[PDB]
Amino acid sequence: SFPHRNLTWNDINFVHTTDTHGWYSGHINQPLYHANWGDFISFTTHMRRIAHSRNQDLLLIDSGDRHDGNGLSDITSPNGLKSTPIFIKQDYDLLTIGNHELYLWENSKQEYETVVNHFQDKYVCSNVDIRLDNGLFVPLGLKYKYFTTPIRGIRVMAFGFLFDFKRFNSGTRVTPMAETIHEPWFQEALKHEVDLIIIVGHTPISHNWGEFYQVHQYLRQFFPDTIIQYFGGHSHIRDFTVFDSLSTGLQSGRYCETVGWTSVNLDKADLNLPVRQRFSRSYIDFNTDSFKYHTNLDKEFDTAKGKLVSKLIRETRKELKLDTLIGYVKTNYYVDYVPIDHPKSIFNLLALKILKTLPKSKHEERITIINTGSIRYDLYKGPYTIDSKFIVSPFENIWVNITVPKSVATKVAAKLNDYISASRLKPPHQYDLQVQQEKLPKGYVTHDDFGADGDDTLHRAVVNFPVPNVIQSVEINDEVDSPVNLVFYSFITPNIIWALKELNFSTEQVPTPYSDIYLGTLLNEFVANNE
Ligand code: NA
Numbered sequence: 298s299f300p301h302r303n304l305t306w307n308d309i310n311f312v313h314t315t316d317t318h319g320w321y322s323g324h325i326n327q328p329l330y331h332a333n334w335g336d337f338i339s340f341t342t343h344m345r346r347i348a349h350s351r352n353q354d355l356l357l358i359d360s361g362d363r364h365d366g367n368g369l370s371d372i373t374s375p376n377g378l379k380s381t382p383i384f385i386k387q388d389y390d391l392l393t394i395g396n397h398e399l400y401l402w403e404n405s406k407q408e409y410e411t412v413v414n415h416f417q418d419k420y421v422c423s424n425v426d427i428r429l430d431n432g433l434f435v436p437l438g439l440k441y442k443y444f445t446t447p448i449r450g451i452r453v454m455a456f457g458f459l460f461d462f463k464r465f466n467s468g469t470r471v472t473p474m475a476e477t478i479h480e481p482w483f484q485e486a487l488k489h490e491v492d493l494i495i496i497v498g499h500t501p502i503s504h505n506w507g508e509f510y511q512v513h514q515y516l517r518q519f520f521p522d523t524i525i526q527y528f529g530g531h532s533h534i535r536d537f538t539v540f541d542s543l544s545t546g547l548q549s550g551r552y553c554e555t556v557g558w559t560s561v562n563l564d565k566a567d568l569n570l571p572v573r574q575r576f577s578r579s580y581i582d583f584n585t586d587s588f589k590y591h592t593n594l595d596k597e598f599d600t601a602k603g604k605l606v607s608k609l610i611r612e613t614r615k616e617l618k619l620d621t622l623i624g625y626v627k628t629n630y631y632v633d634y635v636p637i638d639h640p641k642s643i644f645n646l647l648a649l650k651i652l653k654t655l656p657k658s659k660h661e662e663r664i665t666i667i668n669t670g671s672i673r674y675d676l677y678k679g680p681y682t683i684d685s686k687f688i689v690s691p692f693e694n695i696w697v698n699i700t701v702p703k704s705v706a707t708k709v710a711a712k713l714n715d716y717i718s719a720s721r722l723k724p725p726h727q728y729d730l731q732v733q734q735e736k737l738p739k740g741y742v743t744h745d746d747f748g749a750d751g752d753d754t755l756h757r758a759v760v761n762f763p764v765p766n767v768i769q770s771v772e773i774n775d776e777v778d779s780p781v782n783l784v785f786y787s788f789i790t791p792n793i794i795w796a797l798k799e800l801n802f803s804t805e806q807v808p809t810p811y812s813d814i815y816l817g818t819l820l821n822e823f824v825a826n827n828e
């Protein structure tokens with residue numbers, strides 16, 4: 298029930314999602330994001346119908362990462378078995394892959410067989426290949442799409458680019474977009490005549506990231522006065538970036554908190570329009586107040602399709618037992634509203650109380666290290682459910698260890714916290730922390746290339762502290778040099794090995810299994826107060 302900023306519509310309109318991470322049920326602990334996928338389906342039904350009645354085109358676009366962060370997607374093996382049927386009920390026009398569809402073979406195979414198969418001609422991946430059962434590799438989806446819009450006959454070419462991701466499973470291949478552009482097939486794709494180029498990508502649109510920029514230079518050589526619109530993701534932020542007067546990028550947040558909006562005027566390049574006149578953007582809070590406002594409906598908002606999807610969500614959550622209560626949390630614990638050494642930090646809670654509950658021998662000295670990016674959400678006070686485990690700690694990381702002297706072990710976390718890591722260890726939004734009344738709800742106030750007013754709702758701006766790459770839980774008996782078990786996630790092995798080399802510690806000791814108990818299980822037992 299808030300005052301809203303108006304959307305600017307235009308020739309072609311874009312509705313954008315990214316980094317949904319299975320949040321199709323809506324948010325219970327942040328009611329500004331209460332709406333579910335059904336409501337969003339009602340929303341876009343009307344917004345398409347509205348656009349068509351105004352002789353305008355509208356396209357829905359998704360930039361990937363559709364699991365790892367929610368019970369709806371994560372409770373099943375493989376991930377997404379019950380959330381995908383919900384996701385694909387939305388009528389996307391273009392979509393691409395994120396890195397979370399690529400960590401495990403089961404996920405990549407699932408993606409190819411369900412999502413790509415469903416959105417056969419709409420799923421575009423230019424730089425990711427998948428292994429067929431016969432051992433040969435094929436593009437995971439289309440390498441590009443050439444099409445014309447149904448209302449205004451706009452001739453558009455679309456490409457799809459994943460960021461330079463290193464940890465893909467070996468049943469897939471990612472090629473950096475900087476190399477993809479010099480490949481034979483790409484030059485052949487550039488021979489088309491187009492009114493509009495769409496670059497969808499699970500890639501941050503930030504100029505500090507810099508991958509889309511290199512693609513932009515190359516495309517400007519061949520298409521010097523074509524409108525090129527980018528849709529990015531990965532880094533979990535609302536963002537909008539100007540490449541030039543004929544080119545911008547939109548990024549639409551995370552966790553179904555945000556529906557991104559962009560409209561473009563497609564009058565000729567000769568007219569020399571100001572970029573702010575040609576393009577407009579908005580970030581829409583994922584709630585029905587925002588959805589009802591922008592469609593101008595209330596009583597007539599709910600569609601029969603939307604209502605069916607919302608019912609399917611409730612039926613799915615019930616059957617997965619997601620709202621089954623495990624316990625109660627006494628106080629709020631935050632990812633980054635306080636720093637990691639503050640008592641209301643979820644990282645302090647982990648370092649002081651939870652990580653210590655990993656089983657230990659009587660005389661054992663250990664230091665346990667985790668990356669901050671393994672925690673995906675705040676731990677809110679009140680009821681803690683089955684779903685809460687996956688929302689906070691979705692990853693099925695087991696624990697390995699190496700035994701090293703205390704003199705070395707005590708230096709490792711500081712070494713890792715110093716350092717450009719091959720893969721990002723922090724929560725995704727923690728790399729854009731450059732910065733520039735009581736009635737308003739708490740939410741985002743985005744500062745992008747078009748200024749500070751893109752958010753569809755006036756908010757009291759939320760603030761984050763920087764967090765380190767890793768935190769440690771130290772369990773030693775004294776300050777005396779002794780053997781210490783350095784305990785960590787199997788996947789941060791390369792980082793530990795790097796740190797040990799930087800501390801000039803040589804060993805050909807390899808990490809050995811330490812514990813199969815997931816962090817999420819330790820969290821459950823801590824909350825329940827028994828085990
Ligand atoms: Na910003």
Ligand SMILES: [Zn+2]
Nearest residue numbers: 362395396531
């Ligand atoms: Zn991602």
